Design an enzyme around this catalytic site. Structure first.
Site, short mmCIF file in Angstrom:
data_model
loop_
_atom_site.label_atom_id
_atom_site.label_comp_id
_atom_site.label_asym_id
_atom_site.label_seq_id
_atom_site.Cartn_x
_atom_site.Cartn_y
_atom_site.Cartn_z
N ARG A 1 0.88 -1.21 0.00
CA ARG A 1 0.00 0.00 0.00
C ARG A 1 0.90 1.25 0.00
O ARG A 1 0.49 2.25 -0.55
CB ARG A 1 -0.97 0.05 1.19
CG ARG A 1 -0.28 0.08 2.54
CD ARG A 1 -1.24 0.14 3.75
NE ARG A 1 -0.39 -0.03 4.94
CZ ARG A 1 -0.03 -1.20 5.49
NH1 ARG A 1 -0.47 -2.37 5.04
NH2 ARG A 1 0.80 -1.19 6.52
N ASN A 2 2.12 1.14 0.51
CA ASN A 2 3.03 2.30 0.67
C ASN A 2 4.06 2.33 -0.46
O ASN A 2 5.19 2.92 -0.28
CB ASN A 2 3.61 2.33 2.08
CG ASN A 2 2.53 2.73 3.09
OD1 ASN A 2 1.57 3.38 2.69
ND2 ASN A 2 2.66 2.31 4.34
#
Ligand SMILES: C=CC(=O)Nc1cccc2c1ncn2C
Length: 306
Positions: A142-143
């Site tokens: 997600r990052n």
């Protein structure tokens, strides 16, 4: 003790940029025209909502501080900040969004060459962070953002901490933590190191190789420490050769110093990237294919400041 941090924090006028549309909710897609430069830079603008929370402003400026201090092709580029009622972070627009959503959405069109290249690029970004004595503490699929399908960058320095002159490890005290990405020493003793980031890298690679599956899906976070102590680890993804899975498993060794270094992950994934079909087995891999006045548009990567 340590080298002085001579990064430049650029303060941008609200009139220099236009919000075209909303990406999430409060990140906007917009264009930035540096005053009298004759360039338009696609930007993501993170603007705080409440604006009356002093805690929120301290956290956002900490992220601004870390993002201003990094310069690497595989780490997210901060262009500047705007000090309006609401503090705005102005960053390079990454038009394909986060890699987690991208692998879920495009599972059927992602070949071995893209996956192993992403593994290399994330390892390069993380190696650069270690060279800067920076511990990310929130590496996850997600990052990671997608500038293009060929080019990803580590993002979200909300949890990032800079080891001291003599600081091998970092000690923290509470909050919402991503248990399922965390090294055992981080969950037990809130110890975070470059080697704890390697654990999270292992989990991130597991997410890519399962096309965005949730790790330990349907297991409570309170359970995770017990499972790891018992020696359980995330399962071998179907597309993974033992070669790729074994590297993941080495990232999840209890002895932090037994895990690979980021510089070794760059090397191992690069060898595999040279012959991707030998290391990942994906059905139909060979057929896999991915991508007003725009006259003066320049990507942030071509917009350099002295
Ligand atoms: C459809 C594109 C999209 O959602 N992009 C993005 C999302 C979140 C942060 C983003 C971003 N681009 C740059 N940043 C910092």
């Amino acid at each position: 003790g340590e080298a002085p941090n001579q990064a430049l924090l650029r303060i941008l006028k609200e009139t220099e940029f236009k919000k075209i549309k909303v990406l999430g909710s409060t990140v906007y897609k917009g264009l930035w025209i540096p005053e009298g430069e004759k360039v338009k830079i696609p930007v993501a603008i993170k603007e705080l909502r409440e604006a009356t929370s002093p805690k929120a402003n301290k956290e956002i400026l900490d992220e601004a501080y870390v993002m201003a201090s990094v310069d690497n092709p595989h780490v997210c580029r901060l262009l500047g900040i705007c000090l309006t009622s609401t503090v705005q972070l102005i960053m390079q627009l990454m038009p394909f969004g986060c890699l987690l959503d991208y692998v879920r959405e495009h599972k059927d069109n992602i070949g071995s060459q893209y996956l192993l290249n992403w593994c290399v690029q994330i390892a390069k970004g993380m190696n650069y962070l270690e060279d800067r004595r920076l511990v990310h503490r929130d590496l996850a699929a997600r990052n990671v953002l997608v500038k293009t399908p060929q080019h990803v960058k580590i993002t979200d320095f909300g949890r990032a901490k800079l080891l001291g002159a003599a600081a091998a490890e970092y000690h923290a005290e509470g909050g919402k933590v991503p248990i399922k990405w965390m090294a055992l020493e981080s969950i037990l003793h809130r110890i975070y190191t470059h080697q704890s980031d390697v654990w999270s890298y292992g989990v991130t690679v597991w997410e890519l190789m399962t096309f965005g599956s949730k790790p330990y899906d349907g297991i409570p976070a309170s359970e995770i420490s017990s499972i790891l102590e018992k020696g359980e680890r995330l399962p071998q993804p179907p597309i993974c050769t033992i070669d790729v899975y074994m590297i993941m498993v080495k990232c999840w060794m209890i002895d932090a110093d037994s895990r690979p270094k980021f510089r070794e992950l760059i090397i191992e994934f690069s060898k595999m990237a040279r012959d991707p079909q030998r290391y990942l087995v994906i059905q139909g891999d060979e057929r896999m294919h991915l991508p007003e006045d725009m006259d003066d548009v320049v990507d942030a990567d071509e917009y350099l400041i002295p």
